[model samples]
Target: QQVTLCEQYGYWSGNGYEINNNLWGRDSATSGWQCSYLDGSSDSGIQWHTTWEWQGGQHDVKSYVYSGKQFPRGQRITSINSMQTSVSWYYDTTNVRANVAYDIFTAADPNHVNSSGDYELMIWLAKYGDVQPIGSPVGTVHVNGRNWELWIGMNGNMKVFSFIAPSPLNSWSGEVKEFFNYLQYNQGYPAGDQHLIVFQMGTEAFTGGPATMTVSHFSANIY
Candidate 1:
């Protein structure tokens, strides 16, 4: 089945995942528009996409088309033996600035949930235009046979870590745990006991003309 969200901002859920036109910062934009569609799932994975045309929010993220699973709160990071994901996607951007990434969130207490003061880890597969990660470039690292430029910063009370690939990774697969391990070992991430709360993959549009992100396939297995 297919469900589409055509409002200025909306959402749809299916095939064990949720698709959101989460325009959390749309108010920051002078004028912009966005929409999303859940195109159901296939043997490859869940299929979906989002199209957006935005402007006047140069430094603020307009929306995130979150398409992923929500893990039960309070699960320890170390207890997660594996988090394997494969995604086949591509972007068509015209004079746009955005980033395609996976956003992971963990909290000191599960009860905290999506509240502020949590930890935000981002894996950027591609970045367009002059857009930059939340923080300054800290260093570099290699994971899953790819090199990434790491950045660190803070948003509210949340700690943010971004691993930006040197180039876009349109079709990719790997263990998500390696990302956590890297932060834990190098950046003094919170203990493994911290609750893993959210696992999301989507595009964050800053300011752009017209853009469409097409995900032909996507799957994540966490254990």
Candidate 2:
């Protein structure tokens, strides 16, 4: 079966995941449109795609159409054994200003019940054209057979940590736990109390577009 989403918060769920056309920033866009769809699902994974076109608001993200799941449905960080995901991305070359990334949301307590108090951990596999992560460059770390430059910044009361690759990654397969470990080891994050709220991979569009991003294969797991 196949489904397509076009509304600002349009979504569809099945087989343990949800595909969303979360046009959260459309209000900031001067003019643009985007749609998300389920291409297929097989084995223990799913495939999906998002296409978009935008005219302005070069610095504002127009949408985040993604495939995601609530991590273990409110399970705490200490309870997770290992977290992992694999992806194969094929993006159209259209001079787009955007990112192909993972956006993981976490919470420490009731203080984080809403987005205003939550933490957003971003893992960037690919970035293009004048786009940058939330925070300033902090340092670099090696993990999952890749080196990423870590940056720290904030949104409202929420802190954002972004792990950015120096180059684009078209295909990736690796552990997501190591990232949490790195933060805990280096920055004393979580204190083993945070809940993994959302695990997502999607495109954050800023400008240009009339392009498409397709995840040919995607699987996320919690063990």
Candidate 3:
């Protein structure tokens, strides 16, 4: 069955994945509406989409809506075997201030995506309009045949590391773990004892107008 979410924090779960209409920053918006839909699931994974229309808060995020699943509660970093994902983001390429990316969280404790993590690794595939990552660009790294400009910023006590693509990518598939490896080797994050908790694919809305974003296909695996 398919479902559509409209209320703030609205959610629907099926086929091992959860679709969320998480309007965490709704209060900050002067006027806007957002909704997420669970299209269904395939042998590979789940399919979903979201739409948003915002008029204010040009510099702040209005929401983070996505389809995601929590890995084994608290699997240690050393215990993580492989992590991979494939995402096809087909959308109405109209003007919109937003980002298409993966939001993976890791922490010292085995936590759920609902809560903040010690480390936030964001893999940005597409960026439109005047949107930017949490922090400033610190350096560049080549992984999965793509070059990424890494940005570092702090969200309260959480350390957010954003790997931004130089250009927009409508379709992406590769070893997402390489991003973690880069952090361990260069940034020393997710220490051997730290746990991999959540893996999510979503869009962070900054400001836009009657925009629609869809994921025709999405798959994530960790062993």
Which candidate ranks first by lDDT, i.e. highest?
Answer: 3
Off by over 4 Å in 1: 42-44, 115-117
Instruction: Give the TM-score of each candidate.
Output: 0.93, 0.94, 0.95
Best by TM-score: 3
Per residue, candidate 1 scores C-alpha lDDT tens digits across 91-155 of 87546798889998888787675634378888998888898988799888987677899999999
Q: Rank the candidates by TM-score, best first.
A: 3, 2, 1
Which pairs of residues collide in model 2?
none
Q: What clash pairs does model 1 have?
A: none
* Residue 222 local lDDT, model 2: 85
Tens digits of per-residue lDDT, candidate 3, 75-187, equal 87667877888889866865888899899888887765545788888999988888889879998988778899999999998899999998888889878778888888888
Clashes of each: 0, 0, 0
Native-to-model Cα distance after best TM-score fit, residue 158 in candidate 3, in Å: 1.3
Error of 3 at 79 (Å): 1.6
Give candidate 3 regions above 4 Å deviation. Answer: none
* True-structure lDDT of candidate 1: 0.82
Local error of candidate 1 at residue 19 (angstroms): 0.6
